[PDB]
Amino acid sequence: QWKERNSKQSAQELKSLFEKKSLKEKPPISGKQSILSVRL
Amino acid sequence: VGSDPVILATAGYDHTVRFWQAHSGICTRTVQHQDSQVNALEVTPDRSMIAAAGYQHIRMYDLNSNNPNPIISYDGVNKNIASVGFHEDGRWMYTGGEDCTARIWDLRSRNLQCQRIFQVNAPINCVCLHPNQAELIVGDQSGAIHIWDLKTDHNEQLIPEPEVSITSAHIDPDASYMAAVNSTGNCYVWNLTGGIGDEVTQLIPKTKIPAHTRYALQCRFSPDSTLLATCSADQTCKIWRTSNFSLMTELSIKSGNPGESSRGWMWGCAFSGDSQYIVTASSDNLARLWCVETGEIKREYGGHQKAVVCLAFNDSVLG
Amino acid sequence: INLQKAWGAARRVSKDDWLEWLRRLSLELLKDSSSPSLRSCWALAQAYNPMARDLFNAAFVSCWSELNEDQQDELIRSIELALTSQDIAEVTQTLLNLAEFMEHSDKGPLPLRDDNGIVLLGERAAKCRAYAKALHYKELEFQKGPTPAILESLISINNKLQQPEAAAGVLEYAMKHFGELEIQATWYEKLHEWEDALVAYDKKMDTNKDDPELMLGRMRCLEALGEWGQLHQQCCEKWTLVNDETQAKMARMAAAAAWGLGQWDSME
Amino acid sequence: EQNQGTRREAIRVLGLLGALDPYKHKVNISDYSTSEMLVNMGNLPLDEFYPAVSMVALMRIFRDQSLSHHHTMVVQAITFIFKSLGLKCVQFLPQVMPTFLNVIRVCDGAIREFLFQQLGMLV
Amino acid sequence: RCFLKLGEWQLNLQGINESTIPKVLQYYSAATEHDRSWYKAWHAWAVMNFEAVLHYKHQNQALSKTLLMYTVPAVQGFFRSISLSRGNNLQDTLRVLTLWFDYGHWPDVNEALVEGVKAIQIDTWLQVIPQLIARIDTPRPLVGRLIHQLLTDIGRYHPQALIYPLTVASKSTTTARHNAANKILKNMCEHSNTLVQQAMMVSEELIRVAILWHEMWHEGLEEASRLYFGERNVKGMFEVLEPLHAMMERGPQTLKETSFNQAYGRDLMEAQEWCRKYMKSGNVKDLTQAWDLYYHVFRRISKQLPQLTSLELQYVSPKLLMCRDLELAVPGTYDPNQPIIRIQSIAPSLQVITSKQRPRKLTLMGSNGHEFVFLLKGHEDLRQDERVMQLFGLVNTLLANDPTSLRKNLSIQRYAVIPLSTNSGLIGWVPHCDTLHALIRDYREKKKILLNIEHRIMLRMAPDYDHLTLMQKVEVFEHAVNNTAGDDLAKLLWLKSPSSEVWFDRRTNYTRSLAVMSMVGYILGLGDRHPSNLMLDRLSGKILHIDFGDCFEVAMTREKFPEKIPFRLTRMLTNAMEVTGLDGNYRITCHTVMEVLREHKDSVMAVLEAFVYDPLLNWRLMDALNKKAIQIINRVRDKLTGRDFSHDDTLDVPTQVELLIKQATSHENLCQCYIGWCPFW
C-alpha cells in the first residue's frame, strides 16, 4: 500500500540519501551487435 | 523465461502480456493481466522482472521463473499510471500517475522512506528520469514541463505553448539534448543541463521540428544519441538525425486505400543497442521490427487479438 | 400495360396539347389501377378534373407497382421526355410532386437517367420557381462530391430563397476547404460583399489586362459601393478605345456616376 | 386587370404610398392530415393507402356547397368504398359522417330522399 | 444628450475611481436637470449611484456615512426611473429590491423607500413577487413591515397573482416564514375568503397525490439507511424519519392511506417503539430490531412501485373530484390584462409516467372549455426552474427589442412552472414535442439499426473503455465515429416532412433556435444536456430545453465525470442543420445573440444576482458562505465581457464564439463525457 509522511524533516540527510548524482559512462565505444546479428 | 541477452514484450487490450524473441516471431510466454489495460511496462535494470502499470496498480511479473501472476503488486493511487521506471541500480521506482502526482517508491522491504511526492494542478502524461539519476522531467496535460531535481525540493516550470497537452519526453543517454512532443505534432528541443558540476539545469530552446499534423504519441532518442524516433497518430513514425535535425527516415503502415480510415496508430517505439533496428507497436493488433536504413519492415509479430499500446525491448550493453 | 399509347405517343407540341395529354394520362391511369377505390373514383374523375389531379400519385404508384421491367423503363423514358420537352408550370409541378411522393416511399425514388436525375429535377424545379426542391436536389448533389459549380449554385439558390446567412456559410466552406483562391469575384458580388469583390477584381487585373466583363464587374462594385469619382475616372479613360458590346452595358453606370458627380454635360 | 392605364395608376398609387419594407408588411398581415395523407407520411402500406386518399379526395368535393352537382356520384363512390372494404371501414367514420350529416341538413330537393337512403346503407 | 455622452465616455476612459465618481455624478445630474423627462438620464444617474455604493462597500471590506450619501439618491433616482418605462422596468425593480434588502433598515433609506412604494403603480411589483416572498421572514422590523404592507396591498388589488406562492410559503417548516405567510393570508380573507379556502384545499390536496404514503416512506427509508450505514448518524436518521411517523399518527384520510395503514401500519409502530427504547437507553441491540422492521417494510414497498401506472381520484384523493367548480385560476395562466380562466373540473384519472421519479400527468378543465394538461412532479424542487423561466422571459423581451433579432424570429420557448412545496410542484405540459432520444430510437428501430451500435463498436475495440487514458479514449472515439455514418437526425427530419418548403422552414427554425439556446445556456451554465433533456417541436422544428437543475457550471466542477463542454454540439446535431456546416445560420445567430446579451449585461446580471444571492436557493451551488457565490457572479461577469478564456485580454464576439465552437466540438472533450450523455450522437 501507500503511506505518506516519510523523510519530511531531514534535509541534509535527504541531500545524499537517494540523490547519488551518479554521472559516468562518458566514453562511448563501438560494437558488432552480437544479439541483433544472431537474431538475423 | 528471460534467460537471453535480448528480450521484448508487448501489451494491449486483449488482457495478455506477450513475450517473444526476434528469431521467428513466435511467442514464448503469455502472462495473464486482467481487469485493466496496460499503459506502460518497463524491465528492471537487473533483468529479473518486468513491471506493467495500469489503472491504479503496478503489477510485477517474474522473468526467471514461469509465473503468469503478478507476484508483486502496488496499490494506493486513484487513477491511471502513465509511466514507470526504476533507478539504474534498482533502488527507487518513479511513477507518474494520471490524477495529479509524480511519486517515488522504495523497493526494499524496510523502513527506508526515500519516497517523495510532486503535485501539480494538471494530470501527468509522462515522466522521464535524468541520465544521472538526479533530476526528473514531468510533462502534464497543460503544456507545462516541470524539471524537478531530487537533490532539492523546488522545481522549475516551463511552458512552450499553453492550452495544448504534451504527451512524452526523453533525454538521450549521452545527455546532449532534451526533446518533447505535444498533442499537435510540434517537437520542441531544449538544450539540457550542461553544468554537470552542480546541476545548474540551464535550458535554452534550440529548435522546433514542425511535423506530425495529427497527434504525436511518443518521441524517443537512441542509446547512441545519433537518432530520434517519434510516432504520430497519422500511422507514421519519423526518425530524425541529431546533427541538423532533418528528416532522416520515415516509416508508415498506411495501405494507401481510403477504405481503412486510420485503422491503427503507432503508439510506441524503441531502439537497439546498435541504433540500427527499431521496434514499433501499432494498433493493428501486432508489432513490427524495422531497420533505420532500408526502410522496409524486417519482422512482424501478430499474436495479439486487440490493440497494442505499449512494448518493452531490452538488449545487451554490447551493440 | 395499356397506357403506353398514352405515355409514348410522341406527338405533343403545344402547351394545350401537354395539358390534354396530362388529363388523358391521369384518366386512363385511374380507370384501370387494380384497386377498387381508384377505379370507382374514376367515374367521378371523368366529370371533375381537379379530383383526377389530386389522385394522381396514388394511381401512379398503384399502376407502377404491377408493371414489369421493360414497361416501367419505357414509362421512365416517357416521363423524362415529358420533363425535358415542355416549359409550362402545371405539368412540371405535377411531375415534381410525383417525384417527391415516389422518393418519400419505401421503394425509393423512380430511377431517372442517372442517379434518380437530381441534376435534371433540380434544373427543372429552378425554372419552375420551386426553390425549396431545387435546394434539396442541390444538397443531394453536394453530398456525393463537392465542386465549385455546386457551391456557386448553392449561393445562387440561397440568395433567391431570402437566406443570406446560408450563402455566407457556403462561401466560408468554399474558403476553408479548397485553398487555391478559386473563389471568383462574382461570388463576392452575389453576397453583396462589395469591398471583397473590388479587391478581388483589383488582384485579378493588376497582374494582366484581360478581356471585358473584368472591368464591368469592377465598375459594378464601384457603383454599388457608392464611389462616383473612381467610377467616372475609370469609365472616361476607357469609353473611347472600347467596342460596342460593352458600352451598351456600361452606359447606365456611366450616367449614374456623372449624375453623382454633377457632370450633366457628360451625363447627357 | 389588363388595361394598361389602370395598371399605371395602380403602380402610381403604390409609389405614392411608398416602398413598405417586407417586415412591416408581414407584421400588418385540422388541415394538416390531408397533407400527411396525400404524401403518405404515415407510411401506410400501399394496400390500405388508396382508401384513405380516395376518402379525402371525395370529402374535398363533398364539403363545399357550391359544387353540389356531382354529390350523387360522391355518395355512390363513398358507399361503394364502405361496402368493398368490409369491417375495416370504421376508421373513416369520424371524417365522413359529420360532413354527410351537414350536407343532409343544408341540401334540398329530391336529393335528400336519396341521401337518407344511402345513409341507411352506411348504417 | 451631450452631458450623458460625456459621462459615459469618461466612465469608459478612466473607469470607476475615487476621483471620477463626482464628475460623472455631476454630469448625470446636469443631464437629468436639463431633460427631467428622459428615462435614459435618470437610469444612468441611478446606476452610477448604485455603482458608487458598490465600490465604496467593496473598498472598505478589504464608513456608513458615504454609503448613505450614495444610496439615498440611488433609491430616489431608481424610483423616479421606474415610472418612466412602465413597460419594462425589471432591472430597476430588482435594484430597488436589492437596496431595500441591504440598507432598508437605516432610518434615512426607509423614508425614500416608503415614499416610492406609494409613489409608483401597483403592477410594477407583479414581476418581483418571488424575490419578495423569499425575504418575507427578515429579522428586521422596518423592512419586514414594509414588505408585509406591500404584499397586503398586492393581495388586495390582485389576489390571484399572490395566492399560490403565499399558500406555498404557509406550509413551511420555518416558524417565522410560515407564521408571516399565515398572517398575510388571514389578512387576505377579509375581502376574499372563499378564494383563500379553495386555494388552501387545492394546494394541500394535489400535494398529496404527488407523493403517496408508500412513496414517501420508500424515499425516507432509502435516505435514512444510507445516512445511518454510511455516516453512523443516528441523530440524522431520527430527524429524517420522525416527520413520517408524525404524519402517520394523525390518521389516514383516504382509502389509499387506510390500505397502507392496514398493510404496513403494524411494523412501523413497533419499529418506532424500538427506536424510542434505544433513544431512552443507548444500546444498538434495540436499534437493530427497529432497522430489521424498517428494512422489511422497505423491501415490501419497493416491489410494488413498478406496478404503479395509474391513479384513481376516488382512491387517492376523494376531495379533488368533487369540486365541479372553483374560484381559483388555472395555475400558470394569469395576467391582469386578460379575463381570468377559472378551474372548472379535474379529470378523475391520472397516468403515472414510468421513470425514476414517477411524475403524474394531471389534466384540469378550465371555465372556457379548454383542457390544461400539467405534470405533477414529486421528489424535486421547482424553485430554480421558476427563476430560469423568469430569466428566459427577460431574454425574450431583450431579443424582441432588437431590429436584427426581431426580423429573424429569435426567441426561447418557455413553459409554466408552479412550485407547490420544497419537494413538489406542477410543470406546464408542452404539446407536439418529442424527445431527441425518443426520435433516434424510433428511427433506428424502424431502419433495423441497433440502438447502441457506436457503444458496441467502442466496447469491441476496447473492453475497458471508461478506464483508458485520454489519448486511447480519443482514438477509440474517433474509430467509432469514423466507422459510423451519423446522419439519422437529418434523414429523420426530412422523412417526416410533407413537402420541401415545410422541411426547409423547419430546418431554419431548428438551427436558429438551437444557436440562441446554446449561447443562453453557456451564459447561464446549463449542464447535463443528454439527449433526454432536448425536445423537438414536430410542427415548427424549434428546440426545447428542460431539466434546469445543473446551472452555474456545477457539472463542470463535480468529482465523478466532469464535463468539459459549454453546450451540446455533436455530429448528429450538426449534420441536420445545413449541408455546409455550422458556419452559416448557426454562427451568425450565435454572434447576434451574444452581442445582444453583451449590450444588455446589466439586466441579466441583476436577474442572476437576485437568483444566486437568495439564501434559500443557493444550497445546490455550494456542494465564508458568501465567498463562493461571489466567485460565481464574477465568472458570469467574464462570460458577458469576453474575459472568460484569459484575463490578460478582452475578446470580441467573433473570437469568443469561435473559441466556444472549437471547445464544444472537440474530440478530446467529447471523449470524456459520460456514456449516457451520448457524445457520439
Ligand SMILES: Nc1ncnc2c1ncn2[C@@H]1O[C@H](COP(=O)(O)OP(=O)(O)OP(O)(O)=S)[C@@H](O)[C@H]1O
Ligand atoms: N415540460 C414538458 N412538456 C412536455 N413533455 C415533458 C415536459 N417535461 C417532461 N416531459 C416529458 O416527460 C418525460 C419524463 O419526464 P422527466 O421528469 O424528464 O423524467 P425523469 O427522467 O424522471 O426526469 P429527470 O429529472 O431527467 S431523471 C420527459 O422525458 C418528456 O418525455
